[PDB]
Amino acid sequence: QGVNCTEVPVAIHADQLTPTWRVYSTGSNVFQTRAGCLIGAEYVNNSYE
Amino acid sequence: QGVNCTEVPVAIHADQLTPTWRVYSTGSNVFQTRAGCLIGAEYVNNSYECDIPIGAGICASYQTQSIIAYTMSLGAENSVAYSNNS
Amino acid sequence: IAIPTNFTISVTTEILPVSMTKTSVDCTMYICGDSTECSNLLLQYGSFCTQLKRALTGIAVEQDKNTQEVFAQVKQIYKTPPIKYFGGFNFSQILPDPSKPSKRSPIEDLLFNKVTDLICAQKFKGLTVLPPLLTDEMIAQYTSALLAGTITSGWTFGAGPALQIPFPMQMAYRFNGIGVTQNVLYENQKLIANQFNSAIGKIQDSLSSTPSALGKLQDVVNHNAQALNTLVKQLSSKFGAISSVLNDIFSRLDPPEAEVQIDRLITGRLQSLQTYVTQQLIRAAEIRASANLAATKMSECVLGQSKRVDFCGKGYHLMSFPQSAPHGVVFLHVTYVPAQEKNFTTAPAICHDGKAHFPREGVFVSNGTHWFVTQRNFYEPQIITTDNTFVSGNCDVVIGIVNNTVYDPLQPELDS
Amino acid sequence: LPPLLTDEMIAQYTSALLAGTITSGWTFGAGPALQIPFPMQMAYRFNGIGVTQNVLYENQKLIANQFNSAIGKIQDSLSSTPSALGKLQDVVNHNAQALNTLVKQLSSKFGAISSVLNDIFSRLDPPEAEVQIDRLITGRLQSLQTYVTQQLIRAAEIRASANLAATKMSECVLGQSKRVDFCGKGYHLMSFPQSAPH
Amino acid sequence: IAIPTNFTISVTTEILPVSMTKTSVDCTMYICGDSTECSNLLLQYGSFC
Numbered sequence: 027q028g029v030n031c032t033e034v035p036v037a038i039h040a041d042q043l044t045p046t047w048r049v050y051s052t053g054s055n056v057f058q059t060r061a062g063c064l065i066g067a068e069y070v071n072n073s074y075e
Numbered sequence: 076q077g078v079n080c081t082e083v084p085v086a087i088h089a090d091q092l093t094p095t096w097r098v099y100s101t102g103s104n105v106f107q108t109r110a111g112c113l114i115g116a117e118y119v120n121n122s123y124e125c126d127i128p129i130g131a132g133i134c135a136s137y138q139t140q141s142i143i144a145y146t147m148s149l150g151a152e153n154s155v156a157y158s159n160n161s
Numbered sequence: 162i163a164i165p166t167n168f169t170i171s172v173t174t175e176i177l178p179v180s181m182t183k184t185s186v187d188c189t190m191y192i193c194g195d196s197t198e199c200s201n202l203l204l205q206y207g208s209f210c211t212q213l214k215r216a217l218t219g220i221a222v223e224q225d226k227n228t229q230e231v232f233a234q235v236k237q238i239y240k241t242p243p244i245k246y247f248g249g250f251n252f253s254q255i256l257p258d259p260s261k262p263s264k265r266s267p268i269e270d271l272l273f274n275k276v277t278d279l280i281c282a283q284k285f286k287g288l289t290v291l292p293p294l295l296t297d298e299m300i301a302q303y304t305s306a307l308l309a310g311t312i313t314s315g316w317t318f319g320a321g322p323a324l325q326i327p328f329p330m331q332m333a334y335r336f337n338g339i340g341v342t343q344n345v346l347y348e349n350q351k352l353i354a355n356q357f358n359s360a361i362g363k364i365q366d367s368l369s370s371t372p373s374a375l376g377k378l379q380d381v382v383n384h385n386a387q388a389l390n391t392l393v394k395q396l397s398s399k400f401g402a403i404s405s406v407l408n409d410i411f412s413r414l415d416p417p418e419a420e421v422q423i424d425r426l427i428t429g430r431l432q433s434l435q436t437y438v439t440q441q442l443i444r445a446a447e448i449r450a451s452a453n454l455a456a457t458k459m460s461e462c463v464l465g466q467s468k469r470v471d472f473c474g475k476g477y478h479l480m481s482f483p484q485s486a487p488h489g490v491v492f493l494h495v496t497y498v499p500a501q502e503k504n505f506t507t508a509p510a511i512c513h514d515g516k517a518h519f520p521r522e523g524v525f526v527s528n529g530t531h532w533f534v535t536q537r538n539f540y541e542p543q544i545i546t547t548d549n550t551f552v553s554g555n556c557d558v559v560i561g562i563v564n565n566t567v568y569d570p571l572q573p574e575l576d577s
Numbered sequence: 578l579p580p581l582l583t584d585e586m587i588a589q590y591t592s593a594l595l596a597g598t599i600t601s602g603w604t605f606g607a608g609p610a611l612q613i614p615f616p617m618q619m620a621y622r623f624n625g626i627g628v629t630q631n632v633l634y635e636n637q638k639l640i641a642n643q644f645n646s647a648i649g650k651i652q653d654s655l656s657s658t659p660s661a662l663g664k665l666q667d668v669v670n671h672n673a674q675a676l677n678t679l680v681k682q683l684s685s686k687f688g689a690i691s692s693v694l695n696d697i698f699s700r701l702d703p704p705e706a707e708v709q710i711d712r713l714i715t716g717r718l719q720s721l722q723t724y725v726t727q728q729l730i731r732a733a734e735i736r737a738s739a740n741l742a743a744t745k746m747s748e749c750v751l752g753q754s755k756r757v758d759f760c761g762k763g764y765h766l767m768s769f770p771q772s773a774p775h
Numbered sequence: 776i777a778i779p780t781n782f783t784i785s786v787t788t789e790i791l792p793v794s795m796t797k798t799s800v801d802c803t804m805y806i807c808g809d810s811t812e813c814s815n816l817l818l819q820y821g822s823f824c
């Protein structure tokens with residue numbers, strides 16, 4: 027929430043207080059919304075309910 | 076509250092937080108309801124409007140002689156003469 | 162202009178919570194338990210427990226008051242006639258079934274089934290639940306009496322003595338209320354009855370299939386549960402002290418300097434109880450607002466016909482049915498929806514004999530060759546005559562007026 | 578947290594409601610939308626308040642001119658007077674006020690030596706720094722609980738206001754209401770919706 | 776009796792609040808800041824947040 031996708035943890039071994047649930051960034055379709063950064067979802071150009 | 080009317084603490088001389096104000100039994104009868112165990116009132120088979128709400132459809136009132144308990148009456152039964160063309 | 166040519170009777174379900182679980186708390190067991198020293202120390206912290214008990218009693222009586230105002234709205238207890246015939250209308254799914262011991266309608270039984278050692282553990286901490294004043298049987302009897310009154314008498318019993326009237330006549334009155342003539346019903350009675358039965362069956366099947374419609378009520382129950390859970394968890398917090406067990410504190414520490422930890426625990430428990438009471442007060446206020454809304458809906462939609470838009474369901478409201486659910490009420494709104502619209506040519510007024518004629522309640526339409534007048538909610542063309550039109554002014558100030566002729570009913574037979 | 582519905586979506590809803598009311602009257606709120614000329618809808622609404630259609634049928638021009646003048650006057654009044662939207666503004670202000678308080682309590686000693694906590698740890702041994710931190714955290718937790726309670730009360734009030742607004746929208750915009758003073762002062766004819774910040 | 780002879784079309788404005796700003800509070804760094812030592816005292820208070 028409220029975090030730019032550019033400063034997401036890249037890390038060498040540990041640079042984040044979370045218990046290291048880091049996933050691959052580029053291959054997981056990192057997306058940027060006004061609410062922050064989303065990882066694990068691929069944005070589509072369609073629209074549904 | 077929450078007594079099956081048989082586990083009522085009758086006490087010997089002093090074993091209750093109650094400071095010796097217990098009425099034992101057979102003086103004002105014992106009634107068992109969903110809310111708990113009621114003593115001091117006599118149950119009746121009639122039905123009137125609720126005056127002192129006890130709970131689970133049971134109410135109590137003082138008639139003019141003692142305190143009695145009963146089941147609240149929803150109202151007077153009525154019937155409508157429905158017909159084909161009336 | 163666009164005018165509908167067909168109609169559809171629709172049934173909608175709306176669920177409103179009424180009352181929540183009545184709870185009571187004990188200070189001695191929850192705060193201290195069985196240690197007399199803790200109570201002896203507690204005696205000189207004031208009358209907070211009195212305030213908590215007063216608030217809980219107020220909430221408990223408020224719940225019963227809300228239930229009584231929502232449901233107890235009829236002085237009499239009407240009884241349905243033994244012969245269950247209403248001109249093709251079924252009402253089987255909503256009328257009580259004497260076969261079942263619970264004396265509930267199939268819809269009520271399904272509603273009860275769809276809504277759902279911890280009790281002893283919560284009781285052992287001084288947290289108890291008071292049974293509701295009104296049992297489910299009397300609520301079912303109230304619902305049955307309301308249904309009998311609204312079926313056998315309509316809205317007449319909501320303002321005085323009950324007056325009997327045939328059900329097709331009552332539905333004709335209801336259509337006349339929304340601007341639809343009675344011959345519309347009297348020529349399509351079987352179709353309307355079949356549509357109503359099909360809608361009732363569809364509602365039954367939909368309520369049987371999906372269980373997420375009542376989650377609101379479930380949510381309320383869930384909230385109560387979690388609240389209690391939180392309080393239980395508050396018994397496992399030291400608040401920064403040495404331990405949560407009084408005997409260990411009293412045995413491992415010298416009592417003159419061990420009072421600080423006990424006082425800290427007492428203050429923390431009192432603060433948790435106060436927070437729980439405040440949350441309960443807010444929830445009770447919200448529940449009271451919901452109960453007031455439900456009572457207003459019961460008074461208006463059920464006991465009468467409401468002209469307010471979308472107040473008693475989508476579309477033109479016709480009537481309603483009340484049903485009881487665990488800690489809630491369910492309204493089945495029967496409404497009217499137009500369909501199968503058609504295009505037509507319309508004019509504001511008709512110019513005849515140098516005068517302007519306007520319809521009384523209808524609207525002028527044209528099919529490309531002729532002109533007619535028809536009601537605004539259904540297609541029923543009629544020959545333009547002098548009885549359904551009135552003259553006001555001339556044909557030089559009205560914009561869009563067209564030329565046509567008006568038939569005079571009394572002129573033909575006058576000459577013969 | 579940003580709102581789920583963007584301002585564009587709310588504007589689109591408002592435009593759709595306005596178009597439906599203009600081109601169909603109240604028929605779109607009770608089922609499928611049916612087209613109707615605006616003068617005929619006005620005549621129907623006049624019949625609603627017990628006025629015959631002939632009154633409109635030779636006063637349409639005057640009524641249209643009066644309506645245009647009234648809407649222009651409303652526009653000018655909104656442009657000139659800035660104290661009409663306060664009912665919204667104070668609300669936002671209230672939130673800010675609460676936020677400011679929730680910050681200012683961070684600068685209070687609450688009976689401790691100082692608001693800063695690391696200096697307390699570095700000043701002396703734990704046997705008293707623990708008590709100081711206990712006092713500080715108790716005060717801060719009390720402030721947080723008070724803020725949460727105030728937020729809950731304000732949220733309940735806002736929910737009541739939103740329910741009232743939704744009822745007014747349903748009963749005044751999607752149809753003609755016979756209630757007195759519910760949809761304005763005088764004999765109500767019809768309403769128009771517009772959005773605004775919160 | 777008094778009978779009206781003219782009419783006026785009037786427009787009035789009504790302003791109604793709808794929604795309130797949504798906020799979220801981070802207990803961890805509000806209660807103790809970035810100091811890790813202060814964080815250990817919270818665990819004895821239970822789940823207060």
Ligand SMILES: *[C@@H]1O[C@H](CO)[C@@H](O[C@@H]2O[C@H](CO)[C@@H](O)[C@H](O)[C@H]2NC(C)=O)[C@H](O)[C@H]1NC(C)=O
Binds near residue numbers: 154155156157
């Ligand atoms: C209208 O007719 C109905 C039925 O013919 C009357 O209802 C009956 O009234 C008598 C009173 O002597 C009762 O004994 C019956 O039990 C009633 N029938 C039913 C089905 O309830 C009704 O009283 C008549 N109306 C008036 C004003 O007399």
Ligand SMILES: *[C@@H]1O[C@H](CO)[C@@H](O[C@@H]2O[C@H](CO)[C@@H](O)[C@H](O)[C@H]2NC(C)=O)[C@H](O)[C@H]1NC(C)=O
Binds near residue numbers: 244248
């Ligand atoms: C007039 O009433 C009679 C009976 O009150 C109706 O005849 C049937 O009566 C039986 C009872 O033995 C019911 O189960 C049926 O539903 C009734 N109807 C039919 C069609 O069998 C009769 O239908 C009524 N007529 C009208 C026009 O209402």
Ligand SMILES: *[C@@H]1O[C@H](CO)[C@@H](O[C@@H]2O[C@H](CO)[C@@H](O)[C@H](O)[C@H]2NC(C)=O)[C@H](O)[C@H]1NC(C)=O
Binds near residue numbers: 166167355356501
């Ligand atoms: C109005 O709608 C009703 C049903 O909504 C139509 O009645 C159906 O007509 C079809 C036509 O073959 C029948 O198969 C059905 O059995 C009828 N009943 C039902 C319940 O569907 C009716 O025909 C429509 N009228 C117009 C003029 O469109």
Ligand SMILES: *[C@@H]1O[C@H](CO)[C@@H](O[C@@H]2O[C@H](CO)[C@@H](O)[C@H](O)[C@H]2NC(C)=O)[C@H](O)[C@H]1NC(C)=O
Binds near residue numbers: 251252253254
């Ligand atoms: C009212 O609806 C009920 C359905 O709940 C009908 O009862 C069914 O009637 C059919 C006859 O076609 C039977 O095959 C089913 O076994 C019945 N089910 C139950 C649960 O009773 C009832 O017939 C309808 N009323 C009328 C007058 O037709």
Ligand SMILES: *[C@@H]1O[C@H](CO)[C@@H](O[C@@H]2O[C@H](CO)[C@@H](O)[C@H](O)[C@H]2NC(C)=O)[C@H](O)[C@H]1NC(C)=O
Binds near residue numbers: 528529530531
């Ligand atoms: C418009 O409706 C009128 C209704 O009278 C139609 O006129 C009738 O049309 C039928 C054919 O469907 C003829 O048999 C009648 O003799 C006609 N009567 C009169 C008085 O003209 C008319 O045809 C319709 N026009 C259109 C374009 O549908």
Ligand SMILES: *[C@@H]1O[C@H](CO)[C@@H](O[C@@H]2O[C@H](CO)[C@@H](O)[C@H](O)[C@H]2NC(C)=O)[C@H](O)[C@H]1NC(C)=O
Binds near residue numbers: 512563564
């Ligand atoms: C309806 O009929 C009237 C009368 O026949 C028409 O009024 C005539 O209009 C023509 C030209 O439009 C004039 O030359 C005549 O002097 C008018 N006569 C009268 C008595 O006013 C009227 O035009 C017709 N409506 C339409 C739409 O054509």
Ligand SMILES: *[C@@H]1O[C@H](CO)[C@@H](O[C@@H]2O[C@H](CO)[C@@H](O)[C@H](O)[C@H]2NC(C)=O)[C@H](O)[C@H]1NC(C)=O
Binds near residue numbers: 642780782
């Ligand atoms: C009803 O009121 C309207 C205005 O409120 C009157 O219209 C005015 O008429 C005068 C004289 O004809 C003009 O000078 C004004 O410009 C008109 N007002 C507008 C806004 O155009 C109308 O005359 C009144 N009707 C009666 C019968 O008194």
Ligand SMILES: *[C@@H]1O[C@H](CO)[C@@H](O)[C@H](O)[C@H]1NC(C)=O
Binds near residue numbers: 030031032
């Ligand atoms: C986020 O990163 C992008 C790309 O580096 C940059 O353009 C933008 O200014 C940053 N901040 C925000 C708020 O988007």
Ligand SMILES: *[C@@H]1O[C@H](CO)[C@@H](O)[C@H](O)[C@H]1NC(C)=O
Binds near residue numbers: 079081
């Ligand atoms: C009360 O005791 C009777 C007799 O054993 C028993 O049948 C009944 O279930 C008991 N009720 C409760 C609530 O314990």
Ligand SMILES: *[C@@H]1O[C@H](CO)[C@@H](O)[C@H](O)[C@H]1NC(C)=O
Binds near residue numbers: 163502503504
């Ligand atoms: C009426 O005509 C318009 C355009 O000619 C069309 O879009 C609309 O579907 C028509 N309505 C009906 C009910 O046929």
